[PDB]
Design a protein around this ligand. Sequence first.
Ligand SMILES: C[n+]1cn([C@@H]2O[C@H](COP(=O)(O)OP(=O)(O)OP(=O)(O)OC[C@H]3O[C@@H](n4cnc5c(=O)[nH]c(N)nc54)[C@H](O)[C@@H]3O)[C@@H](O)[C@H]2O)c2nc(N)[nH]c(=O)c21
Ligand SMILES: Nc1ncnc2c1ncn2[C@@H]1O[C@H](CSCC[C@H](N)C(=O)O)[C@@H](O)[C@H]1O
Ligand SMILES: [Zn+2]
Ligand SMILES: [Zn+2]
Lengths: 120, 291
Amino acid sequence: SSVLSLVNFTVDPQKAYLDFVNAGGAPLTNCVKMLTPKTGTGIAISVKPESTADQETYGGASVCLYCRAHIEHPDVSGVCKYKGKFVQIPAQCVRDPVGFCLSNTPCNVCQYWIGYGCNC
Amino acid sequence: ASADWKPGHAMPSLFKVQNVNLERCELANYKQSIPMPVHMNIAKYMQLCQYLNTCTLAVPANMRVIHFGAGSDKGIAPGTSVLRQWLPTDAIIIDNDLNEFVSDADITLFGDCVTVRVGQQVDLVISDMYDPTTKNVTGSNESKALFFTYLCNLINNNLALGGSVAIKITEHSWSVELYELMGKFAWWTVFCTNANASSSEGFLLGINYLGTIKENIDGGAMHANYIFWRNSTPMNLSTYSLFDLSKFQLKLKGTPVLQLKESQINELVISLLSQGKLLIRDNDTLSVSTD
Ligand SMILES: C[n+]1cn([C@@H]2O[C@H](COP(=O)(O)OP(=O)(O)OP(=O)(O)OC[C@H]3O[C@@H](n4cnc5c(=O)[nH]c(N)nc54)[C@H](O)[C@@H]3O)[C@@H](O)[C@H]2O)c2nc(N)[nH]c(=O)c21
Ligand SMILES: Nc1ncnc2c1ncn2[C@@H]1O[C@H](CSCC[C@H](N)C(=O)O)[C@@H](O)[C@H]1O
Ligand SMILES: [Zn+2]
Ligand SMILES: [Zn+2]
């Protein structure tokens, strides 16, 4: 809960978290990792879990920095893109699900993670 | 080891019909923990959901689910996420807890469950509530009030006919009144997950609310039967049931919602309610707020 306190002392919470983890800070813990049949489509954000064999699925609110830190979401509409949904993370990035989400963007055309599934 | 592959154990009629004094609960594996791959409450809620997959749950469109005691000291709600994974995509989840948390629910309310005003009637109530003072065992293990008074009033007033409840109890966290209310459902049991088999925890299930007394239950004697069952039944910690999740999601039954006057409820309606084939409640817009 140290890093959670830290992102309240900044104007750019995304950069604050990323600079912290990139400098050796402990990633946020207690992200809610689901148990899933790894038979999903593999898209980034989904209404039901969609992990492939190379992914893990997390409860969306738990991997959202703005949800976890109880700070304003940057989305112009004010709606969180993860909350109430499921987020698929590459299995090699489960060490920091929140950092991965802050570091990547789903494909605006195919909604797969750009660089981790999106083939457009 | 068939039972290890089941999600847990359900109290059989063999022990429902006993007549015994209330005794201390003594589990051979008490406090033993099973490792997870993943919060323990992920396995616990999934196994509860798996058992409810075998019950005649009413599953309508826009299903109304309220989840009490959803928070943890970590500020997250693993059980609410499991419900999101389990329930239809168009189900409405409202969760609540004394302490602050964030969850994948549609509506999240902080504070005592007594502050949660349900304006309409809901289809499914999940409660994991447990009061810390219950651990201060001094003297006789008597029926508890606490949050059970709220829950009993909820069942009597804000639960659709055909709706169901799953309410966590333990050896010392239990209510005479809540047991007796199970007699107003088509069926009832206590379900103990295999993931938490080393605890006296169980989920008191009322399946398909009928609004009228079907079984006369002596709640004090029935809790004594529940403890007698736990004291008599080897339960091995296990999450084998979660090894195959291909059919985990709640069946999309499309259960109809009907508005009926109580005078119109006949044998056909009671039969449909008891089979999980009908709900009777409003179809307004659901409103659940803090008072
Ligand atoms: C069954 N049993 C009880 N005692 C004795 O009687 C007391 C009351 O039990 P009690 O009714 O809590 O039930 P148990 O401890 O299962 O509950 P267990 O702790 O599993 O309770 C489980 C639930 O506690 C709740 N809980 C744990 N974390 C929190 C929390 O952070 N906040 C709140 N409010 N509740 C929490 C949560 O619902 C969890 O699932 C026990 O504490 C022992 O002294 C037993 N002693 C022996 N030697 N052998 C036994 O088999 C035995
Ligand atoms: N009267 C009450 N109103 C609302 N929540 C209550 C309550 N009494 C106890 N609780 C809650 O009961 C919960 C028991 S632990 C809940 C664990 C949670 N289900 C999970 O998925 O991790 C605690 O969060 C406690 O705050
Ligand atoms: Zn968010
Ligand atoms: Zn693409």
